[PDB]
């Protein structure tokens, strides 16, 4: 796991790289009016790696932990670019900033065109597959604030990627005082207006059959697109998905076996 000092170092170097290179893109991002909108920064992998070797190894080892630190670096770089820009009303701050990593250095181990196998979980790679189905744009109730009998319960539940998007529950029960706090009351269920969403979607990419790596039947990989990556791809279009491979597991039952399929939270979707 990452240490606090290591997190600070990675974030600082990422912020410095974006300030020295992608500053104009951050200006364009803060120029837009819609603050709730999601914005791509499009940081390049190979240049970032050659600038700092520690970033390369740490990102390759733990993409899921590095990406939030990259978003924090985005926030700090946005601070700097906002104080740098003279016009205040034109340049508005964007809380919805997500790092986009593209152009991985050409390495068979780092980037492998084949549909990932179970060994590739928790690793960052390029998965080149043609989109076969494009599921409807179903937004996700990613966060639901939970308040209960416990004073200032303010429990925060995030739909976990590995959980097939079921709200997380505490491993250790904090609701010792009463069963009312143990049970969960859905605030979004009672009233439709108060909620928040991240624009979830699903596509399945099938490996190109013309390639030598693919087998007799072209394997299909299901891709989870979040935030602005939605509507960036269409069915029947050659699509390269730089992302983080994880696995969802359906709610377990004692008799039933573990039901899992590899999934890919895209970190960048590029139309070939």
């Amino acid at each position: 796991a990452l240490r606090a000092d290591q997190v600070s170092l990675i974030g600082q170097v990422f912020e410095s790289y974006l300030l020295q290179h992608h500053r104009d893109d951050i200006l364009g991002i803060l120029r837009q009016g819609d603050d709730e909108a999601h914005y791509p920064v499009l940081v390049d992998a190979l240049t970032l790696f050659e600038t700092n070797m520690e970033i390369g190894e740490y990102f390759n080892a733990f993409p899921s932990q590095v990406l939030p630190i990259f978003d924090g670096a985005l926030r700090r770089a946005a601070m700097a670019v906002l104080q740098a820009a003279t016009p205040s009303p034109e340049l508005r701050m964007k809380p919805n900033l997500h790092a986009r990593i593209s152009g991985l250095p050409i390495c068979p181990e780092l980037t492998r065109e084949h549909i990932p196998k179970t060994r590739d979980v928790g690793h960052f790679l390029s998965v080149t597959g043609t989109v076969i189905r494009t599921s409807l744009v179903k937004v996700l109730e990613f966060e639901r604030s939970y308040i209960c009998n416990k004073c200032k319960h303010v429990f925060v539940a995030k739909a976990d990627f590995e959980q097939y998007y079921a709200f997380c529950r505490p491993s250790a029960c904090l609701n010792e005082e009463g069963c009312n706090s143990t049970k969960f009351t859905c605030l979004s269920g009672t009233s439709s207006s108060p909620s928040s969403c991240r624009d979830y979607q699903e596509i399945k990419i099938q490996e190109q059959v013309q390639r030598l790596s693919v087998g007799s039947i072209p394997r299909c990989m299901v891709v989870v697109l979040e935030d602005d990556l939605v509507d960036s791809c269409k069915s029947g279009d050659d699509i390269t998905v730089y992302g983080v491979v994880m696995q969802r597991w359906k709610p377990f039952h004692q008799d039933a076996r573990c039901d899992l399929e590899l999934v890919l939270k895209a970190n960048y979707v590029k139309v070939n």
Binding site: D34, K138, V139, L140, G189, S192, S193, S195, S196, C197
Partner: protein, 283 residues
Amino acid sequence: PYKGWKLYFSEAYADKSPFVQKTQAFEKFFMQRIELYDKDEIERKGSILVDYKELIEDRELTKSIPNISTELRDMPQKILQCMGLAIHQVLTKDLERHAAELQVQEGLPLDGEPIINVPLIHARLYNYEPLTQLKNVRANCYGKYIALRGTVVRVSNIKPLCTKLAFVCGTCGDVQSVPLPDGKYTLPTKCLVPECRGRSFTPDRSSPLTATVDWQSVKVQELMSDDQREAGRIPRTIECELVQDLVDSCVPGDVVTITGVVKVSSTEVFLLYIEANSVSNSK
């Protein structure tokens, strides 16, 4: 005093709250424009169509509330509730002036319908200038007011929706109605009686307090140019909820500029569905 706020709840209207000042601004705006509209026709419709383009005008309209577009986008429900409250208040005060004239003519202080209960009319805004296409529609638009130019493909037959569900508690023995946002009944929980505090939860429909409004589900797809063969792809569609007078206004095969609030459809992972405010036909 004001009817329906201090009588139902102990807390009175607060002039400190900017919402009340918004109601004052909207009621003044309706007051200067009330000559064109017809009171009886509006009451028959149950709603008032007020132009967004006319309201966006400068000078006193913008002086009373600084950012009308920003306010209407950020909390559309509060703005529409304030606008409907303002139109309801101005209609009531107009009828009060007419009743005063009638009392002077007849000379009898007692008048027909002293309670003079007036139905609540939802205020409706058409010709909303900022327009958001279905491609642009995103989870960011959630909680915001959008205007979309789309053609409705499917119109469901009119189906009741329980906007208010009365609840009677067995221990309490009394009936209270709770406001109901788009079904999804909320349990009354606390009640007037302190000791019983509504421990019994019984939903009933026979009570006259329970009220119901129309709910017609229409699905709209954005009109696509035929210039290129790439154009003509499957359109994005978002379900649209029509409530109260808006029902039957939509007709299949017709383009409608549904300027409505968008919310999540928890039944079907959520998908944005626009709870229509006002539907303007092509003609």
